[PDB]
Ligand binder design. Structure first.
Ligand SMILES: [Zn+2]
Ligand SMILES: [Zn+2]
Lengths: 275, 275, 274
């Protein structure tokens, strides 16, 4: 845990999503299965604020993002978001779109791996949240749809036009984002959108197993792996090797690197501490 | 379209390529099936000048790039291009190579989607033109050859070294550009070069159908999807979400977004206007 | 290239095997018994050799190979890891800078680099292969980016920059974070393999590819690599400027002119690399 806290206290209760933490693994289950977990303004606000809170306290070592019911997440609620935005002032339109983009950025920047447990529909914001995760663990019913243009918006929504070509290549990104057609599991797997394909109904269990695998590993090493992937997407080669050099040298002063060698020489399992 | 015209008038007749516009869709057909549609200096000049004139008046909602005869385009005419360049002065050599790269840039930047209808060979410049398009609609005879090195020039010609790795990955791009070997339809599909694979002989019809599909949709949403994809290839994550935020907020003030919600509430199809 | 000064070429390379024939350099990693595990001195030789070969433009292609049961298992657990555990801050930084500089030097060589893969390619072995322009691999090839297995991050010596640009961010995150083995079929599917050979034929296929490249127009090949590498880090408008200058320049070269001469008279072009 991080000692760098001040006047601000942790939120006692998260009302717009379900948050459970066990042994360093957070599980965030989207609310509203009867609506395919369609997101509201308040759910975005809780995503933003929860991630900021977990990040500043270095609270967990892995996070699973899940949805109950018939699918993962259908995106923003058509009445509670879209209908409401039709009567918002200019500043509040900008604030809403900035908030969703900073949710995706917060997923990309939080000091622990994020795993999306996917099944049925992941559409609109649901598909971008999945895309921002470090891992997508998906069952065969999983259907992505980047369908912003179908509501008259651009496919550059909350980072999708930045992330998608970096995951699947520019030719596939353009097709997916401009036409908004459904991408079923086999195509998704072929083009690079799936980290682990599971058996039908097993996505949540496999996501939990992957989370625990990561949480059992060297946390600082994992978190810095994510940090360097993310930063170096936006850096030139010469700068990337400077960040690598600094980071690897720092980690070589850590307990975990020393423990690897001690365990290796003593022919036993390493016991990681994440420092 | 766009009222922002001044003293400059539209070109009445395009002489070095065939241009046809029907109901917001431009079809540009390369001339010279006899010569495998090899590109002349004037053909490049007409591409440059037509895209500029289509762009500055937002004239169309989609553009198909096509080639008659046995194949899409064999590249630069060997007698008419290479032979001529061998007696050019230093400023003209630079002018020529600037113009070709400009053409590719203009394809990436024009405010409407561009579709390449591919069959037979797309080689050299013809391969790069196809690569720059937003969609590549290809029948099974389609071949790509990025074969600049075969003529003693570098494979990073007119933007190929920039675009190809962002479409197929750095490993594949290196191999394609350094060796210049033919890529046939199955490999092209595998590595991400093909947007839609058609039956033999159906590429032009399928491209037309796709263009009409795009032209029937919300044109401003499509255009911004392309602009954001293009710009965000060259931006960091934090900047990308600021561009997404301004753009989406802007589109939420548009008629097409409002019409999506109106259509939804009356359970009817949206009638898009592109504003 | 004639641009040499007080500094003389290194007479003998003790920490790897270096053989040059008709413009092709073959670099064979030492220590086949230890799966060619790297020492500090092996890294130093890679750095210093690549710098010599580059400043002289001595070679038109370079093959990176390893003998024994596998390509390269990475840094030596005793001679590197063991040693690093008692190093001071400055030397820890120095070491990790050196490894990244070797990878950068591979990306910046003015000739193509080809990795001849088979068996295990792990840790630095995986990243060295990743940095090569071509990966020529037989079906036994197994990649493992296993830095996190030793408590270090997957952003070792450029891996976090290179891998997503080769296989996509989703695959790169998986590979670098879990460090699981990637066998040949998967490697092929995700874009890590340039040419898949039959068992035991990687070194031969690599030799053949190197010669194919050394037989071609060398300036065109080198600039192809230079532009690919630079343009990964440049925006589109700047990339077409670099292409413009470069193509204009190569159009003043002998090879381009030779091509028109040749292709005209239906005789094969005879390249000169200028
Ligand atoms: Zn990519
Ligand atoms: Zn980039």
């Amino acid at each position: 845990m991080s000692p760098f806290t001040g006047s601000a206290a942790p939120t006692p209760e998260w009302r717009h999503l379900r948050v459970e933490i066990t042994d360093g693994v957070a599980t965030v289950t989207l609310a509203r299965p009867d609506k395919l977990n369609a997101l509201t303004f308040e759910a975005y606000a809780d995503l933003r604020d929860l991630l900021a809170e977990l990040s500043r306290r270095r609270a967990v070592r892995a996070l699973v993002l899940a949805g109950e019911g018939r699918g993962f997440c259908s995106g923003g609620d058509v009445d509670e978001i879209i209908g409401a935005t039709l009567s918002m002032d200019t500043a509040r339109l900008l604030d809403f779109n900035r908030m969703t983009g900073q949710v995706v950025r917060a997923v990309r920047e939080c000091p622990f791996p994020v795993i999306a447990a996917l099944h049925g529909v992941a559409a609109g914001a649901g598909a971008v949240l999945a895309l921002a995760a470090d891992f997508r663990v998906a069952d065969p019913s999983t259907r992505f749809a980047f369908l912003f243009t179908r509501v008259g918006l651009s496919g550059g929504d909350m980072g999708a036009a930045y992330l998608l070509p970096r995951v699947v290549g520019l030719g596939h990104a353009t097709r997916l984002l401009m036409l908004g057609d459904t991408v079923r599991a086999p195509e998704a797997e072929r083009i690079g959108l799936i980290s682990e394909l599971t058996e039908e109904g097993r996505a949540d269990e496999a996501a939990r197993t992957l989370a625990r695998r990561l949480a059992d590993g060297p946390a600082l090493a994992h978190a810095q792996t994510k940090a360097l992937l993310t930063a170096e997407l936006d850096m030139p080669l010469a700068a990337a090797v400077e960040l690598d050099a600094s980071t690897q040298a720092l980690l070589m002063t850590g307990e975990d690197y020393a423990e690897f060698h001690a365990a290796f020489t003593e022919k036993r399992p390493p016991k990681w501490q994440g420092r």
